[PDB]
Design a protein around this motif. Sequence first.
Motif, mmCIF file in Angstrom:
data_model
loop_
_atom_site.group_PDB
_atom_site.id
_atom_site.type_symbol
_atom_site.label_atom_id
_atom_site.label_comp_id
_atom_site.label_asym_id
_atom_site.label_seq_id
_atom_site.Cartn_x
_atom_site.Cartn_y
_atom_site.Cartn_z
ATOM 1 N N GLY A 1 -8.274 -11.958 2.787
ATOM 2 C CA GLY A 1 -9.385 -11.037 2.997
ATOM 3 C C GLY A 1 -10.546 -11.239 2.014
ATOM 4 O O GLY A 1 -11.728 -11.172 2.397
ATOM 5 N N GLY B 1 -5.403 -17.019 3.356
ATOM 6 C CA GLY B 1 -4.507 -16.058 3.952
ATOM 7 C C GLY B 1 -3.087 -16.327 3.548
ATOM 8 O O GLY B 1 -2.651 -17.484 3.492
ATOM 9 N N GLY C 1 -3.652 -14.495 13.211
ATOM 10 C CA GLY C 1 -2.920 -13.446 12.520
ATOM 11 C C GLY C 1 -2.785 -12.141 13.257
ATOM 12 O O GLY C 1 -3.265 -12.002 14.373
ATOM 13 N N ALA C 2 -2.126 -11.185 12.609
ATOM 14 C CA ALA C 2 -1.841 -9.866 13.162
ATOM 15 C C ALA C 2 -2.649 -8.758 12.537
ATOM 16 O O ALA C 2 -2.789 -7.694 13.130
ATOM 17 C CB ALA C 2 -0.365 -9.549 12.989
ATOM 18 N N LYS C 3 -3.111 -8.982 11.311
ATOM 19 C CA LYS C 3 -3.914 -8.010 10.569
ATOM 20 C C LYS C 3 -5.328 -7.962 11.202
ATOM 21 O O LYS C 3 -6.314 -8.433 10.640
ATOM 22 C CB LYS C 3 -3.962 -8.447 9.100
ATOM 23 N N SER D 1 -7.263 -5.002 12.419
ATOM 24 C CA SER D 1 -8.150 -3.988 11.834
ATOM 25 C C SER D 1 -8.897 -4.397 10.567
ATOM 26 O O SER D 1 -9.975 -3.880 10.290
ATOM 27 C CB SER D 1 -7.385 -2.687 11.557
ATOM 28 N N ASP D 2 -8.327 -5.317 9.798
ATOM 29 C CA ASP D 2 -8.952 -5.752 8.562
ATOM 30 C C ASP D 2 -9.949 -6.896 8.733
ATOM 31 O O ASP D 2 -10.971 -6.917 8.054
ATOM 32 C CB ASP D 2 -7.877 -6.136 7.533
ATOM 33 N N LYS D 3 -9.669 -7.823 9.656
ATOM 34 C CA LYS D 3 -10.515 -9.014 9.907
ATOM 35 C C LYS D 3 -11.687 -8.898 10.902
ATOM 36 O O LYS D 3 -12.716 -9.561 10.741
ATOM 37 C CB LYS D 3 -9.659 -10.201 10.390
ATOM 38 N N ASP E 1 0.058 -15.841 5.052
ATOM 39 C CA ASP E 1 0.888 -16.586 5.993
ATOM 40 C C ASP E 1 0.309 -17.914 6.423
ATOM 41 O O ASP E 1 1.057 -18.842 6.758
ATOM 42 C CB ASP E 1 1.211 -15.716 7.198
ATOM 43 N N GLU F 1 -5.109 -3.803 19.167
ATOM 44 C CA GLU F 1 -5.509 -2.747 18.248
ATOM 45 C C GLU F 1 -6.511 -1.809 18.933
ATOM 46 O O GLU F 1 -7.735 -1.957 18.808
ATOM 47 C CB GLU F 1 -6.062 -3.331 16.943
ATOM 48 N N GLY G 1 -5.337 -17.059 9.499
ATOM 49 C CA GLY G 1 -4.511 -16.420 10.511
ATOM 50 C C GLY G 1 -3.702 -17.363 11.374
ATOM 51 O O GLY G 1 -4.272 -18.274 11.968
ATOM 52 N N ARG H 1 0.824 -1.194 0.000
ATOM 53 C CA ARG H 1 0.000 0.000 0.000
ATOM 54 C C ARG H 1 0.871 1.262 0.000
ATOM 55 O O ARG H 1 1.125 1.838 1.047
ATOM 56 C CB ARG H 1 -0.919 -0.010 1.224
#
Length: 398
Positions: free
Chosen positions: A376, A352, A194-196, A198-200, A354, A238, A317, A61
């Motif tokens: 996603g 995903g 996972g770490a993402k 805000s998106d999930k 990873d 988060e 994740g 991004r």
Amino acid sequence: EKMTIRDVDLKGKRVIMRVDFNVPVKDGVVQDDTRIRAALPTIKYALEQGAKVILLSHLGRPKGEPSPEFSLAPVAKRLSELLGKEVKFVPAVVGDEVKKAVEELKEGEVLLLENTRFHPGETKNDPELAKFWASLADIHVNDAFGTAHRAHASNVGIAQFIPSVAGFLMEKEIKFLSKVTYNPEKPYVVVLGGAKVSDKIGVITNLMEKADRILIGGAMMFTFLKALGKEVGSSRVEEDKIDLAKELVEKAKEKGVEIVLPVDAVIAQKIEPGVEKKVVRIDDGIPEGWMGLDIGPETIELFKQKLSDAKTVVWNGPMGVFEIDDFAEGTKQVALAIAALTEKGAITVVGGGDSAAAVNKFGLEDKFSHVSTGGGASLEFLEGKELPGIASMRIKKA
Ligand SMILES: Nc1ncnc2c1ncn2[C@@H]1O[C@H](COP(=O)(O)OP(=O)(O)NP(=O)(O)O)[C@@H](O)[C@H]1O
Ligand SMILES: [Mg+2]
């Protein structure tokens, strides 16, 4: 059924193909080429049918301006190695340089343009950007399943100017997920990690409509855990999503949906291999200094129990930082528990970036019903509504 690259005459045509080559790159070398290899069939097919191929893709991004670290140059080199044929790379998205390259393109030649996101119009679905790109070709092939949830210039925009058909990856992904999207045999369990975060977190409100149990691990466990009071300690949380997490745990109860959170965690002060780890309980609290980096032995047993009778499992994740063997047990054991259900007749899906890397690392790739990096995009697909990058494709008629 959408029209596919098989339903069009490609001979002599200029085909602009949108692929998802959003891969991890380190020091100018692709670290994981799974996404590139997944797109190969479509590319090879077009080349054999004697088409002139132009590839479009994003990477990360970028702010909307160029950055060497986000260049697609390393990806063109890797694609050339995988293809066994020279790939021409143009370090531009728009301009004379791009028009000239497409112009000098011979039948059975591939050209890759620079990162689509280096142009501000890409993520805005700018009609002028889409028009320029459409002007370089006769047909548009959308093979970017991983980006199907994004309504961008390169995948949705171009389709409103020239015919847009599905590539083979896009086809395969839709074919599979559709089974699980409409007629999922129950119990249907979703495993998120996972770490993402805000998106999930947002898919939970919708997933809650069709799933029976939702297991949460990875770094995501801490935004939910903190929302419940608990001392997370040094762990990754988060902040901006804690309040939503609170509403989701509340709503799950009212709706009879079970959200399983971890009870214990493997913590460590540092995130490097070989260091001293101590399995602590969340009720006891994670002392500021030690970070939760993998689900503990107790949770592994809990998750296994909660998974034992599932007929449909969707996993996205890693449970912990599987990269470092010290914190990979949660991921391995969960992956193993899920792969076992497949043999017993359950439909198992891994989605995903990873997560796919994780199953590969343990030699489990052929043990699941379906494996995807379009992490996603696949979670959103399961929600039932048609994705923008899928809606943009031509319906198959007669
Ligand atoms: N407790 C943890 N703390 C920090 N990072 C973690 C933890 N557990 C897992 N992760 C990391 O999160 C990463 C996986 O992130 P994520 O990008 O969200 O998953 P993914 O399978 O690629 N899914 P997607 O982005 O949806 O395709 C890996 O780098 C993991 O080590
Ligand atoms: Mg990821």
